[PDB]
Design a protein around this ligand. Structure first.
Ligand SMILES: Nc1ccn([C@H]2C[C@H](O)[C@@H](COP(=O)(O)NP(=O)(O)OP(=O)(O)O)O2)c(=O)n1
Ligand SMILES: [Mn+2]
Ligand SMILES: [Mn+2]
Ligand code: NA
Ligand code: NA
Length: 326
DNA sequence: CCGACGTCGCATCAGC
DNA sequence: GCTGATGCGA
DNA sequence: GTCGG
């Protein structure tokens, strides 16, 4: 955590540009700068030293010099003191409320937690559930709890159909001692890139999880992706566990490796790897890796038999999940 | 300089 | 209702 | 905000 002060500053600047300025590429630029500094193994002593890193340019180098010298950034100081930015920034912390809805709400004089509770009628379903569990969703999940959750999910899925395979991905698969949520990759032999031989494959799994009162709420739900809320069972006289975010992703079984690569992350690792893939003349999604044709159009899917095969195509040394925490 | 910046799913809305 | 764009999110 | 070509 050598440069925590610097990475915190950049992250706050990223959130500002995303939530307030609605400038997603500035948000990404700061996300990237924060990431490359985060894994830089020296305590940074100047902006010039920082500017050597890819993604760190002049402006950020200048900001790092201010931060090192003073321990603050006047730019951030002002943003903090500002009514509207602070309100918009806060509202986006509710799941389902983004930059657009947040700014629209603030315009209407809705800018506090109290205001949201008072105006629940103005929320779409996602946002209402997000407000309901605002407190809970602030809390992180200890890996021990994640292990309990894994046991329930894997066993309940087994009970539906023994041919399901459920794989917990995200920060958990990367070995994090705590997680923001739980991500579950799901496969079933009936669903491949070639055919879907059974309907409601994801539905049946969700339904079962609701039945045992594990899944408590639904944010969104389609044929291949579920976003919702779950909770561990507590014992007698035990205070209940916090409600947790969970999302589930049904991937065609023959495309498991691209799927698990995607869902393991991190988000920035995925961006770095896909950017590199493009440089090498391939494109990668959660389904396939395709070569790019000489006019830039994606071609047929390439054979994939392991995560490492995808790494091999773009000439990257294989990296274990725990080294993908970028 | 300066266009281009990872790829896609589900909810909602605009237009017909 | 459908098609495509936008919002929010993985 | 950054950068490659
Ligand atoms: N922008 C994003 C967000 C997520 N993802 C993929 C990579 C993530 O590791 C995986 C799960 O998303 P996530 O749950 O938001 N983040 P993740 O599990 O990495 O870390 P946590 O904050 O949940 O601990 O989805 C992505 O490819 N692009
Ligand atoms: Mn996660
Ligand atoms: Mn998730
Ligand atoms: Na740089
Ligand atoms: Na939000």
């Amino acid at each position: 955590t050598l440069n925590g002060g610097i990475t915190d500053m950049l992250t706050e600047l990223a959130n500002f540009e995303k939530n307030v300025s609605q400038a997603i590429h500035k948000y990404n630029a700061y996300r990237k700068a924060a990431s490359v500094i985060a894994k830089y193994p020296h305590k940074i002593k100047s902006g010039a030293e920082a500017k050597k890193l890819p993604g760190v340019g002049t402006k950020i180098a200048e900001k790092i010099d201010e931060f090192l010298a003073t321990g603050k950034l006047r730019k951030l100081e002002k943003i903090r003191q500002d009514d509207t930015s602070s309100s918009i920034n806060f509202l986006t912390r509710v799941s389902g409320i983004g930059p657009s809805a947040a700014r629209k709400f603030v315009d209407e004089g809705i800018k506090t937690l109290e205001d949201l509770r008072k105006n629940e009628d103005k929320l779409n379903h996602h946002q209402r559930i997000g407000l309901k569990y605002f407190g809970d969703f602030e809390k992180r999940i200890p890996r021990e709890e994640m292990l309990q959750m894994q046991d329930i999910v894997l066993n309940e899925v087994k009970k539906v159909d023994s041919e399901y395979i459920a794989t917990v991905c995200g920060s958990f698969r990367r070995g994090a001692e705590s997680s923001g949520d739980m991500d579950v990759l799901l496969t079933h032999p009936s669903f491949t890139s070639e055919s879907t031989k059974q309907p409601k494959l994801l539905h049946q799994v969700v339904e079962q999880l609701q039945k045992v009162h594990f899944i408590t709420d639904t944010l969104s739900k389609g044929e291949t992706k579920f976003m919702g809320v779950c909770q561990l069972p507590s014992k007698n006289d035990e205070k209940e566990y916090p409600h947790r975010r969970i999302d589930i992703r049904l991937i065609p079984k023959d495309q498991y490796y691209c799927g698990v690569l995607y869902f393991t992350g991190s988000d920035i690792f995925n961006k770095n790897m896909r950017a590199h893939a493009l440089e090498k003349g391939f494109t990668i999604n959660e389904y396939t890796i395709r070569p790019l044709g000489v006019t830039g159009v994606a071609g047929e899917p390439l054979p994939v038999d392991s995560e490492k095969d995808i790494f091999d195509y773009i000439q990257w040394k294989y990296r274990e999940p725990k080294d993908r925490s970028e």
